[PDB]
Amino acid sequence: GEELFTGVVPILIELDGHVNGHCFFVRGEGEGDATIGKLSLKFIATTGKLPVPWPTLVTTLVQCFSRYPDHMKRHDFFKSAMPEGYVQERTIYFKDDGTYKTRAEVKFEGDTLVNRIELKGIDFKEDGNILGHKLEYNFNSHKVYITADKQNNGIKANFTIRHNVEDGSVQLADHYQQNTPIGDDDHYLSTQTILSHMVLLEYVTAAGI
Ligand SMILES: [Cu+2]
């Protein structure tokens, strides 16, 4: 489980998406430190111009790289599922706006960690905040309230994300998440993200006990 996360671990992220007739593929490459809670990644859209702003995809684009304190070692589901891996299912509602439905798989493939993702965008208003590209190239710090799930031997997590509209307004994005381990208590993750193709740096830790 945590045997594999001690030290630097390379990452490969793939994502296929369909949003209002526009399809796109995004590849991500980099590394991650779970002992520190770091994530340095460089995402590239292989279909040219993305029909959707990058910051909306950040949320869906690997929660086993989040830092764990030594008193929450026994609450890190993500690392325990490894190397067998878990499925990352999520639906995302943009208030007064369109919805994502996603499914993804996180596994170890060799010495590198691999995350392939499926994405489907529905009911998005054109010239909106999403299809109009009216969201700023930034991402704030959020709480990710994780809850245990004995019905599916896995994890659920609810949270909503404030995207910053260029008018000074705020676009909300509700997240319902489910995670199920392939094979065989209420805490939360505080995150922090900087947008700098697309480059990212993140620091995420576990708190609430
Ligand atoms: Cu499709």
mmCIF file of C-alpha atoms and ligand atoms in Angstrom:
data_model
loop_
_atom_site.group_PDB
_atom_site.id
_atom_site.type_symbol
_atom_site.label_atom_id
_atom_site.label_comp_id
_atom_site.label_asym_id
_atom_site.label_seq_id
_atom_site.Cartn_x
_atom_site.Cartn_y
_atom_site.Cartn_z
ATOM 1 C CA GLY A 1 0.000 0.000 0.000
ATOM 2 C CA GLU A 2 2.124 2.865 1.349
ATOM 3 C CA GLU A 3 5.138 0.703 0.374
ATOM 4 C CA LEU A 4 4.874 2.131 -3.148
ATOM 5 C CA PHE A 5 4.386 5.828 -2.291
ATOM 6 C CA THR A 6 7.551 6.426 -0.256
ATOM 7 C CA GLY A 7 9.759 8.411 -2.641
ATOM 8 C CA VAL A 8 9.202 10.072 -6.005
ATOM 9 C CA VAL A 9 6.608 8.308 -8.180
ATOM 10 C CA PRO A 10 6.114 9.153 -11.899
ATOM 11 C CA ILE A 11 2.570 9.797 -13.167
ATOM 12 C CA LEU A 12 0.738 9.363 -16.490
ATOM 13 C CA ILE A 13 -2.736 10.903 -16.869
ATOM 14 C CA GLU A 14 -5.083 10.395 -19.837
ATOM 15 C CA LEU A 15 -8.547 11.913 -20.327
ATOM 16 C CA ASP A 16 -11.209 11.597 -23.041
ATOM 17 C CA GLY A 17 -14.084 14.085 -23.018
ATOM 18 C CA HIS A 18 -17.213 14.885 -24.990
ATOM 19 C CA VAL A 19 -18.854 18.278 -24.382
ATOM 20 C CA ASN A 20 -21.662 19.676 -26.576
ATOM 21 C CA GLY A 21 -20.337 18.073 -29.779
ATOM 22 C CA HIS A 22 -16.714 18.947 -28.995
ATOM 23 C CA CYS A 23 -14.384 16.030 -28.243
ATOM 24 C CA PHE A 24 -10.847 16.307 -26.856
ATOM 25 C CA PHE A 25 -7.988 14.250 -25.456
ATOM 26 C CA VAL A 26 -5.588 15.470 -22.772
ATOM 27 C CA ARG A 27 -2.359 13.738 -21.749
ATOM 28 C CA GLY A 28 -0.584 14.520 -18.467
ATOM 29 C CA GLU A 29 2.996 13.741 -17.447
ATOM 30 C CA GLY A 30 5.059 14.400 -14.316
ATOM 31 C CA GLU A 31 5.784 13.062 -10.829
ATOM 32 C CA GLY A 32 4.329 13.115 -7.306
ATOM 33 C CA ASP A 33 5.452 12.997 -3.663
ATOM 34 C CA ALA A 34 2.924 11.521 -1.231
ATOM 35 C CA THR A 35 5.336 11.990 1.689
ATOM 36 C CA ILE A 36 5.205 15.758 1.034
ATOM 37 C CA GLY A 37 1.805 16.001 -0.703
ATOM 38 C CA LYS A 38 3.212 17.452 -3.936
ATOM 39 C CA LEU A 39 1.975 17.096 -7.522
ATOM 40 C CA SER A 40 3.997 18.542 -10.419
ATOM 41 C CA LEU A 41 2.278 17.819 -13.756
ATOM 42 C CA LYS A 42 2.246 19.184 -17.325
ATOM 43 C CA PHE A 43 -1.002 18.595 -19.238
ATOM 44 C CA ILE A 44 -1.196 18.893 -23.041
ATOM 45 C CA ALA A 45 -4.333 18.941 -25.199
ATOM 46 C CA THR A 46 -3.566 16.756 -28.235
ATOM 47 C CA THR A 47 -6.684 18.021 -30.063
ATOM 48 C CA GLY A 48 -5.456 21.643 -30.120
ATOM 49 C CA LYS A 49 -7.727 24.291 -28.612
ATOM 50 C CA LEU A 50 -9.839 22.930 -25.760
ATOM 51 C CA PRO A 51 -13.568 23.758 -25.992
ATOM 52 C CA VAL A 52 -13.659 23.927 -22.187
ATOM 53 C CA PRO A 53 -11.509 26.069 -19.838
ATOM 54 C CA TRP A 54 -8.627 24.232 -18.135
ATOM 55 C CA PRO A 55 -9.574 25.104 -14.528
ATOM 56 C CA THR A 56 -12.872 23.161 -14.762
ATOM 57 C CA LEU A 57 -10.962 20.012 -15.730
ATOM 58 C CA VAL A 58 -8.355 20.360 -12.957
ATOM 59 C CA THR A 59 -10.700 18.763 -10.427
ATOM 60 C CA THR A 60 -11.219 15.620 -12.555
ATOM 61 C CA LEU A 61 -7.710 15.308 -14.085
ATOM 62 C CA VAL A 62 -4.825 11.655 -8.311
ATOM 63 C CA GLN A 63 -5.906 11.640 -4.678
ATOM 64 C CA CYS A 64 -3.404 9.014 -3.467
ATOM 65 C CA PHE A 65 -0.625 11.621 -3.710
ATOM 66 C CA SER A 66 -2.212 13.691 -0.943
ATOM 67 C CA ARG A 67 -0.055 13.885 2.191
ATOM 68 C CA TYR A 68 -0.995 11.786 5.206
ATOM 69 C CA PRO A 69 0.070 12.614 8.753
ATOM 70 C CA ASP A 70 1.407 9.775 10.915
ATOM 71 C CA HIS A 71 -1.864 9.718 12.923
ATOM 72 C CA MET A 72 -4.052 9.328 9.792
ATOM 73 C CA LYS A 73 -2.072 6.505 8.126
ATOM 74 C CA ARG A 74 -5.126 4.300 8.706
ATOM 75 C CA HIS A 75 -7.473 6.676 6.892
ATOM 76 C CA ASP A 76 -5.692 6.783 3.522
ATOM 77 C CA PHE A 77 -7.943 4.577 1.386
ATOM 78 C CA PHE A 78 -6.327 5.686 -1.866
ATOM 79 C CA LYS A 79 -2.877 4.284 -1.077
ATOM 80 C CA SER A 80 -4.297 1.074 0.427
ATOM 81 C CA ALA A 81 -6.192 0.163 -2.742
ATOM 82 C CA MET A 82 -2.827 0.211 -4.548
ATOM 83 C CA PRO A 83 -1.428 -1.504 -6.463
ATOM 84 C CA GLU A 84 -4.823 -3.131 -7.264
ATOM 85 C CA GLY A 85 -6.272 0.364 -7.803
ATOM 86 C CA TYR A 86 -9.667 2.048 -7.501
ATOM 87 C CA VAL A 87 -12.343 3.491 -9.796
ATOM 88 C CA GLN A 88 -12.972 7.249 -9.576
ATOM 89 C CA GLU A 89 -16.595 8.032 -10.481
ATOM 90 C CA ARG A 90 -17.887 11.591 -10.242
ATOM 91 C CA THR A 91 -20.748 13.845 -11.355
ATOM 92 C CA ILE A 92 -20.295 17.641 -11.332
ATOM 93 C CA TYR A 93 -23.131 20.197 -11.453
ATOM 94 C CA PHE A 94 -22.369 23.745 -12.571
ATOM 95 C CA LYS A 95 -25.158 25.832 -11.024
ATOM 96 C CA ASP A 96 -27.288 27.576 -13.671
ATOM 97 C CA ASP A 97 -24.997 25.709 -16.084
ATOM 98 C CA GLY A 98 -24.017 22.306 -17.496
ATOM 99 C CA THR A 99 -22.978 19.074 -15.827
ATOM 100 C CA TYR A 100 -20.060 16.639 -16.090
ATOM 101 C CA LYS A 101 -20.360 12.906 -15.570
ATOM 102 C CA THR A 102 -17.006 11.169 -15.214
ATOM 103 C CA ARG A 103 -15.486 7.755 -14.595
ATOM 104 C CA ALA A 104 -11.762 7.057 -14.139
ATOM 105 C CA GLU A 105 -9.281 4.343 -13.176
ATOM 106 C CA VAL A 106 -6.187 4.822 -11.011
ATOM 107 C CA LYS A 107 -3.631 1.981 -11.076
ATOM 108 C CA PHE A 108 0.083 1.194 -11.151
ATOM 109 C CA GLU A 109 1.313 0.192 -14.607
ATOM 110 C CA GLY A 110 4.952 -0.807 -14.164
ATOM 111 C CA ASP A 111 6.868 1.706 -12.059
ATOM 112 C CA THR A 112 4.593 4.603 -13.081
ATOM 113 C CA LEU A 113 1.119 5.476 -11.819
ATOM 114 C CA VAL A 114 -1.581 5.728 -14.476
ATOM 115 C CA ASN A 115 -4.908 7.572 -14.449
ATOM 116 C CA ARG A 116 -7.205 7.181 -17.451
ATOM 117 C CA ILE A 117 -10.396 9.249 -17.304
ATOM 118 C CA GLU A 118 -13.722 9.362 -19.158
ATOM 119 C CA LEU A 119 -15.702 12.607 -19.381
ATOM 120 C CA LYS A 120 -19.140 13.554 -20.739
ATOM 121 C CA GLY A 121 -20.469 17.134 -20.810
ATOM 122 C CA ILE A 122 -24.203 17.820 -21.044
ATOM 123 C CA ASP A 123 -26.600 20.807 -21.129
ATOM 124 C CA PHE A 124 -23.830 23.423 -21.296
ATOM 125 C CA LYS A 125 -25.064 26.875 -22.249
ATOM 126 C CA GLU A 126 -23.185 28.275 -25.235
ATOM 127 C CA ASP A 127 -21.583 31.678 -24.679
ATOM 128 C CA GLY A 128 -21.932 30.714 -21.000
ATOM 129 C CA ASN A 129 -19.122 30.735 -18.454
ATOM 130 C CA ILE A 130 -17.842 27.396 -19.778
ATOM 131 C CA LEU A 131 -18.447 27.338 -23.540
ATOM 132 C CA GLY A 132 -17.849 31.111 -23.616
ATOM 133 C CA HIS A 133 -14.515 30.747 -21.771
ATOM 134 C CA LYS A 134 -15.433 33.380 -19.163
ATOM 135 C CA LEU A 135 -13.493 31.769 -16.274
ATOM 136 C CA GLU A 136 -10.108 32.968 -15.016
ATOM 137 C CA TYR A 137 -6.969 30.824 -15.299
ATOM 138 C CA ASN A 138 -6.791 30.139 -11.545
ATOM 139 C CA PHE A 139 -7.870 27.698 -8.828
ATOM 140 C CA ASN A 140 -8.423 28.238 -5.106
ATOM 141 C CA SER A 141 -7.988 26.166 -1.930
ATOM 142 C CA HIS A 142 -10.883 23.800 -1.159
ATOM 143 C CA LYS A 143 -12.020 21.267 1.407
ATOM 144 C CA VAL A 144 -12.736 17.750 0.162
ATOM 145 C CA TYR A 145 -14.997 16.141 2.764
ATOM 146 C CA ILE A 146 -14.376 12.386 2.512
ATOM 147 C CA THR A 147 -16.885 9.861 3.894
ATOM 148 C CA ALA A 148 -16.594 6.065 4.237
ATOM 149 C CA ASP A 149 -18.877 3.693 2.331
ATOM 150 C CA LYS A 150 -19.388 0.130 3.571
ATOM 151 C CA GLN A 151 -22.133 -0.570 1.001
ATOM 152 C CA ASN A 152 -19.521 -0.487 -1.789
ATOM 153 C CA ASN A 153 -16.352 -1.155 0.256
ATOM 154 C CA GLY A 154 -15.157 2.272 -0.888
ATOM 155 C CA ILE A 155 -15.238 6.049 -0.467
ATOM 156 C CA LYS A 156 -17.619 8.937 -1.167
ATOM 157 C CA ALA A 157 -16.769 12.643 -1.088
ATOM 158 C CA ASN A 158 -18.831 15.819 -1.456
ATOM 159 C CA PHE A 159 -17.573 19.358 -2.115
ATOM 160 C CA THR A 160 -18.218 22.349 -4.388
ATOM 161 C CA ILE A 161 -15.602 24.382 -6.247
ATOM 162 C CA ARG A 162 -15.638 28.156 -6.742
ATOM 163 C CA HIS A 163 -14.377 29.039 -10.223
ATOM 164 C CA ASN A 164 -13.467 32.714 -10.618
ATOM 165 C CA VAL A 165 -15.390 34.503 -13.372
ATOM 166 C CA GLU A 166 -13.478 37.299 -15.154
ATOM 167 C CA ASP A 167 -16.287 39.750 -14.277
ATOM 168 C CA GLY A 168 -15.436 39.234 -10.585
ATOM 169 C CA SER A 169 -18.336 36.800 -10.244
ATOM 170 C CA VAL A 170 -18.193 33.173 -9.063
ATOM 171 C CA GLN A 171 -19.164 30.009 -10.960
ATOM 172 C CA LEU A 172 -20.001 27.162 -8.556
ATOM 173 C CA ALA A 173 -19.327 23.501 -9.391
ATOM 174 C CA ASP A 174 -20.858 20.870 -7.086
ATOM 175 C CA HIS A 175 -18.988 17.564 -6.822
ATOM 176 C CA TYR A 176 -20.439 14.206 -5.859
ATOM 177 C CA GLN A 177 -17.692 11.576 -5.853
ATOM 178 C CA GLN A 178 -17.621 7.783 -5.455
ATOM 179 C CA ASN A 179 -14.536 5.551 -5.278
ATOM 180 C CA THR A 180 -14.536 1.748 -5.445
ATOM 181 C CA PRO A 181 -11.476 -0.475 -5.030
ATOM 182 C CA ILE A 182 -10.757 -3.055 -7.715
ATOM 183 C CA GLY A 183 -9.934 -6.410 -6.113
ATOM 184 C CA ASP A 184 -10.253 -7.109 -2.391
ATOM 185 C CA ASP A 185 -13.904 8.098 9.608
ATOM 186 C CA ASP A 186 -15.099 11.439 8.235
ATOM 187 C CA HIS A 187 -12.001 13.489 7.393
ATOM 188 C CA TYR A 188 -11.183 15.994 4.652
ATOM 189 C CA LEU A 189 -8.467 17.207 2.302
ATOM 190 C CA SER A 190 -7.381 20.839 2.145
ATOM 191 C CA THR A 191 -5.941 21.578 -1.307
ATOM 192 C CA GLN A 192 -3.998 24.375 -3.006
ATOM 193 C CA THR A 193 -3.431 24.735 -6.771
ATOM 194 C CA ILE A 194 -1.503 27.031 -9.151
ATOM 195 C CA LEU A 195 -2.146 27.157 -12.894
ATOM 196 C CA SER A 196 1.010 27.963 -14.890
ATOM 197 C CA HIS A 197 -0.849 22.869 -22.752
ATOM 198 C CA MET A 198 -1.032 23.400 -18.964
ATOM 199 C CA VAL A 199 1.398 23.194 -16.015
ATOM 200 C CA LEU A 200 0.289 22.611 -12.418
ATOM 201 C CA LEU A 201 1.652 22.435 -8.892
ATOM 202 C CA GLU A 202 -0.428 21.216 -5.957
ATOM 203 C CA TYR A 203 -0.130 20.743 -2.211
ATOM 204 C CA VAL A 204 -2.808 18.633 -0.532
ATOM 205 C CA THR A 205 -2.866 17.341 3.057
ATOM 206 C CA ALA A 206 -5.272 15.377 5.276
ATOM 207 C CA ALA A 207 -6.957 16.992 8.287
ATOM 208 C CA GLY A 208 -9.965 16.583 10.591
ATOM 209 C CA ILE A 209 -9.008 14.267 13.483
HETATM 210 CU CU CU B 1 -18.980 10.661 -26.488
#
